[PDB]
Amino acid sequence: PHMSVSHLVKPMTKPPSTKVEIRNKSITFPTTEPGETSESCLELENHGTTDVKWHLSSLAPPYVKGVDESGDVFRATYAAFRCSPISGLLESHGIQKVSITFLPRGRGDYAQFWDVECHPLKEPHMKHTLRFQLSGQSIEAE
């Protein structure tokens, strides 16, 4: 019987280029009328000491269920969600609000995956990715 002298291997460390945070990876808009808009926001926060270049992009078009009685999920042919701004430079210790709108065109339950891509301005190779998801349903008022 003896004390262990072993350790878990640790081949990688998270560098300072990963110090950019979003607080919620999911927003669910309230139930929104077709053709009306609903509004929410997320924030990017740069906890590092460098200026960070960032850009948001959707990973695929919105996917929508409950459009008809088929039991199929469809892809929307339009941008049901919009983010503003979609790119920028975020200074050290800065917080950027991203305003997000949901503008359905018809009954359905909508969602979409997005990511934020960022890196320190001076080190474009030191990339960091943040996933978020958007969702909301559209029901007509009776």
Q: Does 60 bind Cl ion (CB under 5 A)?
A: yes
Contact 21, 47 (CB under 8 A): yes
Region of 10-18, 48-56, 58-66, 127-135 interacting with Cl ion (CB under 5 A):
58-66
Region of 12-20, 22-30, 53-61, 96-104 interacting with Cl ion (CB under 5 A):
53-61
Pull the structure tokens for residue 125.
């190779």
At 118, give phi and psi (nearest 5°). Answer: -145, 165
Query: What is the C-alpha radius of gyration for the chain, rounded to an integer number of angstroms?
Result: 20
9-34 CB burial, b ≥16 within 10 A, e <16: eeeeeeeebbbbeeeeeebebeebee
Q: Does 9 bind Cl ion (CB under 5 A)?
A: no
Nearer to Cl ion, 46 or 112 (CB): 112
Region of 9-17, 57-65, 89-97, 131-139 interacting with Cl ion (CB under 5 A):
57-65
Instruction: Work out how close the CB of 61 gets to Cl ion at its nearest, in angstroms, rounded to a whole number.
Output: 8
Q: Does 5 bind Cl ion (CB under 5 A)?
A: no
Instruction: Return the residues of window 73-132 that contact Cl ion according to CB under 5 A.
Output: 113
Tell the burial category of 6 from Cβ atoms under 10 Å away from its Cβ (0-12, 13-18, 19+).
Answer: exposed
Nearer to Cl ion, 74 or 113 (CB): 113
User: What are the residues binding Cl ion (CB under 5 A)?
Assistant: 60, 113
